[PDB]
């Protein structure tokens, strides 16, 4: 007769029930005032930012009319308002923030994980591991689809995987932007163009003109995944190094050693990126030249030759901008 | 010389700066203990649920050995443990919850909007309006692609829109599940199958056998969007009615009038759904019959004929289940 155990467990879980429901009640109260605090802080910050920017506008428009001797105080005045802006960014980094017009077309609730600092730093790492693992899958299946097979089922499967990976990746990093980062919005239009390119390659009716481009496209995709493979290593190394510099617990790792390490890494890495840039430019060129041949007539060739050229222009300019800015930073 | 205004605005915004940073500090503190409370509550609830289910298991296995006269107390004992489970569901409805293995493959942070009740009820409405608006776009462009055009560019564009809409929609409702709902997981595998179907239709190389199926597929897509058009009306009406019943402020709207209205609406709606079910079954049949013709040889025909049949079986069974359960509920 084990019922006795069950019944006295019933009432002891019952006493637990009330002592836990009291906690639940006070929790609800706490949540209420915390919400009020959040609303108050956000409204106040918005008002202050507006006031600051407008007064800075007024001072800037009045500045040329004024001589430099009294303008001394003025230049350190903007030199301090900019850091006031920086601290405003710091403070806004926690308060829940509105969605940025692309998430709001897929979602509509609020996801600002960075209510802590560990809770954010341990999201970017997960993102990096996602990029690496998917690159493994793509390089493997690209090898299979280029050296040993010639069908169109497998080719369509590879292109579908590509067009899914790019879209989930643009969602992750469009969250990672409003949490906080400097992600240089070209790096997202890059995904949109690459998605359009794969999509067009998906409805290419074969014949005697597909087989002339399949080889180059597959090989280039292989190489690009390899570059992502190396870039993982450098990026993750940089992230851990920078945390270990910000966290002084391990040892007083000076900024000098970090900078030397990062500079050596980047300067070693850069030739491969430039090789890839020129590889796709040559790719676009051969595609146009092929299109000029009067033997083909398919609208897919020019529409698959423009994204390559656009994509090269953007990538080349942005890489040079980053290296040049880093060089002046020194 | 407007500098004076600017400088005294500087120091008055400065006094504002400290009086706001104090608020920020206390806000951070509050957030800290609120996090501790959340963790404590979730751990406690997990332990209690495990204990309750295991003791219920023990009682159930011991029950057949025991006679009914003493089992009286036993049946109201399970009749009360089930409501204890219900209240546990209520309480867990607020605490942040882990992601369900599909979001965690696209995301990895936590989005439980239902920290309130308005903040959730005003998400489902947005979801409904999204479904309606996208149905408008699809019905319009389907009309254009069937009566007046015959190309393949426009057809591919329509199929791409379909395969994007289904995927964003499965993301929205897979959030809406873990917030809280009874969404009958067949209704999501439905989206996966429909996505696979459109994908296969996307790489169909035309010829003398595509033109025999294009008409039926487009017309069926039109009709299906029309059913979504009506289902919006009924669903939104039901949601507002149920809120107006739960909210007794307007008037003591009895459950009887609500039930009569909902029953009339559903009984009026059902014939169209059944028509659609049989429409797609006939569609799968004609597709197989066409495949039997020795004049075609394309692997796309059987792979486009199975999802139709599978999809019909699932839809028919699930609709009958819902109507039967609702009938016993009365
Ligand atoms: C830019 C590059 C030198 C990296 O340098 P970097 O670490 O970004 O240097 P910065 O200090 O400017 O970093 C700026 C921000 O860009 C972010 N970033 C996000 N996505 C990125 C991406 N795809 N590439 C580069 N930077 C990226 C970094 O995270 C960093 O922000 P955070 O560190 O604060 O989170 C290198 O990644 C690059 O050139 N990108 C190549 C892109 C590519 O795939 N090309 C392939 C051609 S075949
Ligand atoms: C099922 C149906 C009668 C709706 O009834 P219902 O309101 O779901 O009745 P229930 O009380 O069982 O509702 C159960 C839950 O299912 C949810 N639900 C979510 N997505 C749904 C969907 N696509 N269809 C039906 N119910 C859905 C409802 O929101 C409800 O949960 P909630 O009200 O607590 O949020 C009706 O929508 C249906 O038969 N679906 C047809 C699906 C379809 O598109 N078929 C096309 C064939 S051509």
Numbering used by the authors:
A (entry chain A), B (entry chain B): 7 to 336
Study authors write:
TMEM120A, a member of the transmembrane protein 120 (TMEM120) family, has a pivotal function in adipocyte differentiation and metabolism, and may also contribute to sensing mechanical pain by functioning as an ion channel named TACAN. HsTMEM120A forms a symmetrical homodimer with each monomer containing an amino-terminal coiled-coil motif followed by a transmembrane domain with six membrane-spanning helices. Each monomer contains an N-terminal soluble domain (NTD) on the cytosolic side and a transmembrane domain (TMD) embedded in a lipid bilayer. The TMD contains a bundle of six transmembrane helices (TM1-6) forming an asymmetric funnel with a wide opening on the intracellular side and a bottleneck on the extracellular side.
Unexpectedly, the HsTMEM120A protein reconstituted in nanodiscs contains a CoASH molecule per monomer that is from an endogenous cellular source and copurified along with the protein. Firstly, a small-molecule density is observed in the intracellular funnel-like cavity of each monomer and the density matches well with the CoASH model but not with the CoA derivatives (such as acetyl-CoA or fatty acyl CoA) or other nucleotide analogs. The CoASH molecule assumes a bent conformation and forms numerous specific interactions with amino acid residues on the lumen surface of the cavity. The 5-pyrophosphate and 3-phosphate groups of CoASH are positioned at the entrance of the cavity, while the adenosine and cysteamine groups of CoASH are inserted deep in the intracellular cavity pocket of HsTMEM120A in a key-lock mode. The blue dotted lines indicate the hydrogen bonds or the salt bridge between Lys130 NZ and CoASH O2B (3.6 Å), Lys130 NZ and CoASH O8A (3.4 Å), and Gln237 NE2 and CoASH N1A (3.8 Å). In the presence of CoASH, the intracellular cavity of HsTMEM120A is not only constricted by the four residues at the extracellular side but also blocked by the bulky adenosine 3-phosphate 5-pyrophosphate group of CoASH as well as its cysteamine and pantothenate groups. In case that TMEM120A does function as a mechanosensitive channel, the CoASH molecule may serve as a plug to block the intracellular entry and consequently stabilize the channel in a closed state, while the intracellular cavity may become accessible to ions upon dissociation of CoASH molecule from the cavity.
